[PDB]
Amino acid sequence: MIKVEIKPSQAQFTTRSGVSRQGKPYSLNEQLCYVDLGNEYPVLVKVTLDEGQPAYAPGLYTVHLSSFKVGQFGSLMIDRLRLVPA
Amino acid sequence: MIKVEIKPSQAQFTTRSGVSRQGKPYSLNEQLCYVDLGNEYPVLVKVTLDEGQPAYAPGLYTVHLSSFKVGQFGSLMIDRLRLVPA
């Protein structure tokens, strides 16, 4: 299991916006977190939230299976890092 | 934890080869496996092995933390799926 932490300072998201190739509006909500990759300290990682989802509250989390998909070259990839409480 | 299985039919690797941009030879060893992504059946995934490593034997495995890295856009990515016995 991957240990992910939302610190008290990371309790909000920001939103970026634009227009798609064929005219549709989009909005993306992004939040920061710390992921422990086994180095001396955890590293900073950007998370893009799914539609209609609030910012994750401060606390400890792990990664949900729905974060992964098989890519176009047949290898596993992360689609979007989706988190669940630890 | 991600459940990965090497079936008895997947106990070998194949090797692809070529030459890099500035003249160096390379070889890549690839093995197939099944990863349970929570659908009705596990899906087929290609794994590229690290230098000097043998094919994983048939059995159950999970994913090692060293499989992940932060990408050039600041989001988590899989570098290479590295497996450890379950």
Describe the structure.
The structure is a homodimer of 86-residue chains. Chain A starts with a strand and ends with a strand. In chain A, a hairpin with a 5-residue loop joins strand 6 (68-70) and strand 7. Helices cover 0% and strands 47% of the residues of chain A. With 86 residues, chain A is mainly β. The first copy, chain A, has strands at residues 4-6, 14-19, 25-35, 43-48, 59-63, 68-70, 76-78, 83-85. Chain A is globular and about 45 Å long. The first copy, chain A, has no helices and eight strands. In chain A, the strands form two sheets. In chain A, strands 1, 2, 3, 4, 5 and 8 form a six-stranded antiparallel sheet that branches. In chain A, strands 6-7 form a two-stranded antiparallel ribbon. Chains A, B: The record marks 16, 21, 26, 34, 46 as: Involved in DNA binding.
